[PDB]
Amino acid sequence: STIMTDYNPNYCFAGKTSSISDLKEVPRKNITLIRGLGGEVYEGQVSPLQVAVKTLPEVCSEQDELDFLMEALIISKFNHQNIVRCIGVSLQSLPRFILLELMAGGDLKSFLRETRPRPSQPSSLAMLDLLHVARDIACGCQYLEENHFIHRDIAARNCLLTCPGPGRVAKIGDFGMARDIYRACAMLPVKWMPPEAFMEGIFTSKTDTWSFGVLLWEIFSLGYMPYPSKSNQEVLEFVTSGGRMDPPKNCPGPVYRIMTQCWQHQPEDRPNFAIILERIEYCTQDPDVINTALPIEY
Ligand SMILES: CCc1cc2c(cc1N1CCC(N3CCOCC3)CC1)C(C)(C)c1[nH]c3cc(C#N)ccc3c1C2=O
CATH class of the missing domain: 1.10.510.10 (Transferase(Phosphotransferase) domain 1)
Structure with a gap:
């Protein structure tokens, strides 16, 4: 994303700084959507790992793009059994995905x-x-x-x-x-x-x-x-x-x-x-x- 790349926001949590380059990019060919569940949340699988998939609409504002990145950064940096895990992201294909614990x-x-x-x-x-x-x-x-x-x-x-x-x-x-x-x-x-x-x-x-x-x-x-x-x-x-x-x-x-x-x-x-x-x-x-x-x- 050019918006995500040009802004390239940093995110700080627990004294450590991360950015888009730190997110675990899952190749899009490894991700399959199975059904809609609930923005849109889908059940998917990663080649397999069962996941929840949040999607970013292709028709969205620049703010929506930045919001989506910040959501990815926030969830990826938490490490606790009572906070949903982030498996990774697929931000280099459209529509953009964040992959979460089902x-x-x-x-x-x-x-x-x-x-x-x-x-x-x-x-x-x-x-x-x-x-x-x-x-x-x-x-x-x-x-x-x-x-x-x-x-x-x-x-x-x-x-x-x-x-x-x-x-x-x-x-x-x-x-x-x-x-x-x-x-x-x-x-x-x-x-x-x-x-x-x-x-x-x-x-x-x-x-x-x-x-x-x-x-x-x-x-x-x-x-x-x-x-x-x-x-x-x-x-x-x-x-x-x-x-x-x-x-x-x-x-x-x-x-x-x-x-x-x-x-x-x-x-x-x-x-x-x-x-x-x-x-x-x-x-x-x-x-x-x-x-x-x-x-x-x-
Ligand atoms: C497979 C099941 C499921 C799973 C999930 C969700 C909803 C489901 N189902 C919705 C449909 C119901 N059915 C059951 C049969 O009767 C009709 C309703 C049965 C629960 C929702 C949409 C609530 C959800 N939001 C998330 C946010 C984040 C983050 N960050 C991470 C994961 C999730 C999930 C999920 O993993």
Whole structure:
């Protein structure tokens, strides 16, 4: 790409600088698309390795090209089991591809909605399944925090699962907001943002702690939209004024208490991710938490 070549942006993560020349270019003849899944995401294979393929439309702006490169650089430099892997890229053929770990369980929000206990599947999910998802994402967030990377958009829609069934691992699977900020409103994820985002606009890992609290609410509600029946501005005014969400239906007290600590008004009063993990791990050990039945959706 001449835009990518002429600009040739550097990307810094964890004290190391990378650029387009550092990306692992997979020959296009080795890549086959199998089906569309979800911009466009396809299932593909690399000669074989099963992958997810993100594509860049051939009709795109110069900014879109640079965005796509920065997304590749960002994902390629992460090294953690709870962040989706990047197999490589194919940027020297059109349309351009980024090749990612296939996450056959799909996105977490959709999974929660589709796998809710119902009279026909009364035991589809248990509390422990939800705590394992929470732990998995908290582990990824702790890696980001330890590497001074602020995600800015932790939400169930941005988490992915390795498979639908038992043994699934949840991973962070989108970095678009971080990418936009690295390169730099009705599209802001207001419902995931702490009060101070709207005051001084200052982001820290404590902003990700707040968002993680909202993710935990999403998990234990089985995929409900946060602040049901409030608009973005209503939520902004609500949370600023000290308003917080009620516990999800049947949510154990100890889990709800993790949410409420994540939502402390003062950032310094919120737990870091090592503390969040410890609390999630204690909940997972407590028989009265894990023996709590999830509500049936009639
Ligand atoms: C093979 C399965 C799959 C896999 C993936 C995805 C969706 C799927 N499916 C969508 C279709 C469903 N079906 C199941 C049958 O009923 C209809 C819905 C079953 C999940 C989505 C589109 C969510 C996805 N986004 C990604 C982003 C990044 C990054 N960075 C990396 C990987 C991904 C993936 C995936 O690997």
